[PDB]
Design a protein around this ligand. Structure first.
Ligand code: CL
Ligand code: CL
Ligand code: CL
Ligand code: NA
Lengths: 64, 68
C-alpha cells in the first residue's frame, strides 16, 4: 500500500550509490594519475641531482 | 497545515544537505584536477632540466677524452 514509498526509497538509494561510484571512478583515476606523477617527479629530482653531481665532478677534472 | 509544513521542511533540509555535499565533492575534484595540472607542469620543467644536463655532461665527457 505504502510499500510504493519503500520501493522508491530503495531505488533512490541505488541511484545515489551509482552516482557515488561514478564520482569515485573520477576521483580514483585522478588520484592514481597524481600518485604516478609524484613518483615520476621524485625520479626526475633524483636524476637531476645525480647529473649535477657528475657535471661538477667533470668541471673539476677539466679545471684540474 | 502542520503536515504540509513538516513535509516541506524535511525536503528542504534534505536539499541543503545535498547541495552542501555536492559543493564538497566538486571542490575535492577540482583540487585533484589542479594538482594533476601542477605536477605535469613541474615535471615538464624537471624533464627539460634533466635532458639539458644529460647533454651537458656528455659534452664535458668528450672534453675530458680530448686530453687523454
Ligand atoms: Cl560521493
Ligand atoms: Cl571514498
Ligand atoms: Cl651520470
Ligand atoms: Na612547464
Amino acid at each position: 500500500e505504502e510499500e510504493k514509498r519503500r520501493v522508491r526509497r530503495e531505488r533512490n538509494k541505488l541511484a545515489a550509490a551509482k552516482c557515488r561510484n561514478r564520482r569515485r571512478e573520477l576521483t580514483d583515476r585522478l588520484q592514481a594519475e597524481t600518485d604516478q606523477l609524484e613518483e615520476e617527479k621524485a625520479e626526475l629530482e633524483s636524476e637531476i641531482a645525480e647529473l649535477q653531481k657528475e657535471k661538477e665532478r667533470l668541471e673539476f677534472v677539466l679545471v684540474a | 497545515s502542520q503536515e504540509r509544513i513538516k513535509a516541506e521542511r524535511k525536503r528542504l533540509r534534505n536539499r541543503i544537505a545535498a547541495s552542501k555535499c555536492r559543493k564538497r565533492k566538486l571542490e575535492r575534484i577540482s583540487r585533484l584536477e589542479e594538482k594533476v595540472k601542477t605536477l605535469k607542469s613541474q615535471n615538464t620543467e624537471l624533464a627539460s632540466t634533466a635532458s639539458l644536463l644529460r647533454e651537458q655532461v656528455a659534452q664535458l665527457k668528450q672534453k675530458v677524452l680530448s686530453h687523454v
